[PDB]
Design a protein around this nucleic acid. Structure first.
Lengths: 540, 406
RNA sequence: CUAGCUAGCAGUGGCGCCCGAACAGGGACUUGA
């Protein structure tokens, strides 16, 4: 193994932590002895422990497929004192973000952790003893904190010459799998595979739809593994964890699959025999069946041709997106329904959706796709020109399909002749929570109504609500609290607080409306008047 | 070469912030430049032996089609400030903001010719991303002085002045200021004379192999624009309401402002569209407020120790306003920016703002942009044409600043 | 160090407890109208 090693260091002001090997039983020694002699005669573990004052814990267990007992080494105290190392692995790939490889194959190298050496200076921290006799690791040991990082670094450093010799071979490396493919003939494909096998054997490496972490990769397409669901009544805690994992791994690709019914029905359950009781769970699982009755099939990304995106609203602040390159040949689908912010509306959610989609396209495909938005050009330009923030989207076009994305109402910047003045205000004590709300008019048609368990903001909201309730066709309203100003000027359609929702539902039927703002407690028109009218026994 | 020993500060480690994704078209230029920079010995590949990581992105520089790479050293600079701040720093002259012309220059090629300390290279490790996370990150490590970390000019200024002395002696009126990799020149001559002098300086810098191809700014056109009020014969109730609101807000800025006479005309509860006769007393107070407004707000100094804050807002149709202040309501400099896509204009505005603050005071001010975090974080690499990264955040604006201007 | 004198691994994915880090809502301190 003439491969170059990696310089390894230790945390400053630290050293090898000693361990007091627990005296174990006897029905686990002979196997340990035979296995350490077997690993010693291979030349990857040395036994030089004459004066080394260090020790590491040793364990043994018989796992599934019981044929023999194997050794186990732990570093619960060694990895803690070991300096931190960079972790290159930070995400997961996507099946749709692949290419079209006619001659595709897979390859994995098992037990390759022994085929990589370790720094001789760092080998001082591999005190592996057993009742005595001590051994020292000479290769990368299992369970090491920096084992996968060093392994993948060595893998890349050893396959880079093969990439230099043949840059026209698409290679998708991983922890141990080597997803290699190209567009060559079967003979040329086998020749390249044999050349790669010889290249790995140069350093002594074992060279022996598809499966990719549960995915299905066909030569001409790709799809998700068809999941199933048991049809029993009881569900143990193991069954619970398993089914919730299945539905979580299925909801990431399929739409309309949620976990609110199982989350709400599986609260506080820490037992194993607990038989959770309902019709809601039954209908949710039947919908999951119906959706999983027909499997979806994606298409590999084509680098030559571009790709188009589109989004269609489904109702109740839920929006689904599609990514495609050819008509009806969609790559992947999904859903976006997060209520970002207290007050949201149509174009704000559309901007959030398009930014999420372009971020996904950057992280998956590394480019920006064209968008087919179901909205008009002049509406969007008026919106972003008449907004107090900065919102920009890439090039797009219009598609005629319900439901259309429009604005339920608009606003003005100057009063209208024939309107009526409306000075509104209202507050309550910080302990009684019993406040009122009124207003004034030219003709003198005021109206005060008390409230119960309300805050000043909600008092002003109720005041403007009752103002717009008995108003004419075109009225103007002036207030003082900038909170209602910011709420109304944003022009929402769906908010968390239903109060503003009923307010906008009452205002939308009105043709025109104008808003203003005046500093309170300055005697401006009817502000101080309504303040004195509503402050009866709440001011002093 | 004897590299100056540079160290970090105890208690804080190096930067370990993640790297946002990029586009494959940018990855092409990234590979095509890092291969050359590694063949030139400026960088070298490393492994996972160092957990420190700093993001890297690329821009499309003007005057050519190259893709100059840059590293956001915000964390490194924020953690090593004290070194270049008290150990070896450079003061800020005041004569450059009174000249006629100024030309921006880059001297990164000079930084690319000096080795860096070996014990410090483990903190400037930069990594490039990969598409679909298939190929692991191709890590690298700097071997020369990088661009973005303000310690490299702090340690290079010696040789910089040593090289610029032979030609700056015959030109006593010239000014040289290098807060970062950028380079500004102070000249109060005509456009032709400034052109000749700047091409002479280009020759002087290329004498040592410096490939150097907004560009020419003017500091004399920077006047303080205070709050302006409308003056029309028609005075509706809405107009006087907006006026009293604006002046009640500005009372924190202008102390000697009252609402005595203005609060009398609007006392009668009436409608809004009607016109009210403006009395001479309210007219006198309005004229007083007008003549006080044009006077610059006194008492606003410049603290060379505290930080800077430069808020920016958007009015519409490109009407970008901006205010700079070290303390709330203690504005130091205002202005306007309009008549230049929705993010390109914002990037140009923040670029102009930070350039003016650098050539005036010499300190990158913190920004408050009125934009969502994810959108700008993903689209700020489109039209960015600078070489360093400033500090910023994401805060909304109240519904009052929209009435600060027309 | 943990679990009932005795037994006591790690990584990957998942659903479950506590704390910290970001967004949104209620009280105290300070400064002015």
């Amino acid at each position: 193994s003439p491969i170059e090693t990696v310089p390894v260091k230790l945390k400053p002001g630290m050293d090898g932590p000693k361990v007091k090997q627990w005296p174990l039983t006897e029905e686990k020694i002979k196997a340990l002895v035979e296995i350490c002699t077997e690993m010693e005669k291979e030349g990857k573990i040395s036994k030089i422990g004459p004066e080394n004052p260090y020790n590491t814990p040793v364990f043994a267990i018989k796992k599934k497929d019981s044929t023999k007992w194997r050794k186990l080494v732990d570093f619960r105290e060694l990895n803690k004192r070991t300096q931190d190392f960079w972790e290159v692995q930070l995400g997961i790939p996507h099946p749709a973000g692949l290419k079209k490889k006619k001659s595709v194959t897979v390859l994995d190298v098992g037990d390759a952790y022994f085929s990589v050496p370790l720094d001789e200076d760092f080998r001082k921290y591999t005190a592996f003893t057993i009742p005595g006799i001590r051994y020292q690791y000479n290769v990368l040991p299992q369970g090491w904190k920096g084992s996968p990082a060093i392994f993948q670094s060595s893998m890349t450093k050893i396959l880079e010459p093969f990439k230099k010799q043949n840059p026209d071979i698409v290679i998708y490396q991983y922890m141990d799998d080597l997803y290699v493919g190209s567009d060559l003939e079967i003979g040329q494909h086998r020749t390249k595979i044999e050349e790669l096998r010889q290249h790995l054997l140069r350093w002594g490496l074992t060279t022996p739809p598809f499966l990719w972490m549960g995915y299905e990769l066909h030569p001409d397409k790709w799809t998700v593994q068809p999941i199933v669901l048991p049809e029993k009544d009881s569900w143990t805690v193991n069954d619970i964890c398993k089914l919730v994992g299945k539905l979580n791994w299925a909801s990431q690709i399929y739409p309309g699959i949620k976990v609110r019914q199982l989350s709400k029905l599986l609260r506080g359950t820490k037992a194993l025999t607990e038989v959770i009781p309902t019709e809601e769970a039954e209908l949710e699982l039947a919908e999951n069946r119906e959706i999983l009755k027909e499997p979806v099939h994606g298409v590999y990304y084509d680098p030559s041709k571009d790709l188009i995106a589109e989004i269609q609203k489904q109702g109740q602040g839920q929006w689904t997106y599609q990514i495609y390159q050819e008509p009806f040949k969609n790559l992947k689908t999904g859903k976006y329904a997060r209520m970002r912010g207290a007050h949201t509306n149509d174009v704000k959610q559309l901007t959030e959706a398009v930014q999420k989609i372009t971020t996904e396209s950057i992280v998956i495909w590394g480019k920006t796709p064209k968008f087919k938005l179901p909205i008009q050009k002049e509406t969007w330009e008026t919106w972003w020109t008449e907004y107090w923030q900065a919102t920009w989207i890439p090039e797009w076009e219009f598609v005629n399909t319900p439901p259309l994305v429009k604005l339920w109402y608009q606003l003005e910047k100057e009063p209208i002749v024939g309107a009526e003045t409306f000075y509104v205000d209202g507050a309550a004590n910080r302990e009684t929570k019993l406040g009122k709300a009124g207003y004034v008019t030219n003709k003198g048609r005021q109206k005060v109504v008390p409230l119960t368990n309300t805050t000043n903001q909600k008092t002003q909201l109720q005041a403007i609500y009752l103002a717009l309730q008995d108003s004419g066709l075109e009225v103007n309203i002036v207030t003082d609290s900038q909170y209602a100003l910011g709420i109304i000027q944003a022009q929402p359609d769906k908010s968390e607080s239903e109060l503003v929702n009923q307010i906008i539902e009452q205002l939308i039927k009105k043709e025109k409306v104008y808003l203003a703002w005046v500093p309170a407690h300055k005697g401006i028109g009817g502000n101080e008047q309504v303040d004195k009218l509503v402050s009866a026994g709440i001011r002093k | 070469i004897e590299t100056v020993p540079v160290k970090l500060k105890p208690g804080m480690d190096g930067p370990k912030v993640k790297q946002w994704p990029l586009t494959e078209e940018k990855i092409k230029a990234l590979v095509e430049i890092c291969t050359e920079m590694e063949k030139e010995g400026k960088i070298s590949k490393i492994g996972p032996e160092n957990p420190y990581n700093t993001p890297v992105f690329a821009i499309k520089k003007k005057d050519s089609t190259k893709w100059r790479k840059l590293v956001d050293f915000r964390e490194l600079n924020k953690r090593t400030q004290d070194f270049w701040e008290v150990q070896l720093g450079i003061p800020h002259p005041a004569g450059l903001k009174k000249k006629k012309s100024v030309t921006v220059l880059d001297v990164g090629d000079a930084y690319f010719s000096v080795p860096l300390d070996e014990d410090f290279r483990k903190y400037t490790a930069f990594t490039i991303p990969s598409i679909n996370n298939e190929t692991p990150g191709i890590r690298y490590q700097y071997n020369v002085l990088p661009q973005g970390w303000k310690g490299s000019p702090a340690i290079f200024q010696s040789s910089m002045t040593k090289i610029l002395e032979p030609f700056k002696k015959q030109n006593p009126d010239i000014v040289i200021y290098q807060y970062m990799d950028d380079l500004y020149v102070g000249s109060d001559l005509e456009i032709g004379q400034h052109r000749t002098k700047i091409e002479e300086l280009r020759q002087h810098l290329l004498r040592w192999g410096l490939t150097t191809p907004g560009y020419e700014l003017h500091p004399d056109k920077w006047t303080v624009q205070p709050i302006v009020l409308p003056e029309k014969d028609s005075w509706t109730v809405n107009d006087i309401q907006k006026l009293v609101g604006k002046l009640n807000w500005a009372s924190q800025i202008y102390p000697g402002i009252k609402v005595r006479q203005l609060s009398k005309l609007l006392r009668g509860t009436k409608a809004l569209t009607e016109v009210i006769p403006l009395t001479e007393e309210a007219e006198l107070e309005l004229a007083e407020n007008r003549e006080i407004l044009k006077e610059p707000v006194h008492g606003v100094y410049y603290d060379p120790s505290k930080d800077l804050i430069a808020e920016i807002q958007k009015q519409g149709q490109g009407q970008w306003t901006y205010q700079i202040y070290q303390e709330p309501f203690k504005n130091l400099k205002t202005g306007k920016y309009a008549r230049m896509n929705d993010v390109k204009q914002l990037t140009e505005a923040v670029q102009k703002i930070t350039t003016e603050s650098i050539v005036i005071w010499g300190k990158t001010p913190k920004f408050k942009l009125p934009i969502q975090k994810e959108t700008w974080e993903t689209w700020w690499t489109e039209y960015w044409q600078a070489t360093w990264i400033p500090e910023w955040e994401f805060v909304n604006t109240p519904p009052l600043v929209k009435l600060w201007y027309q």
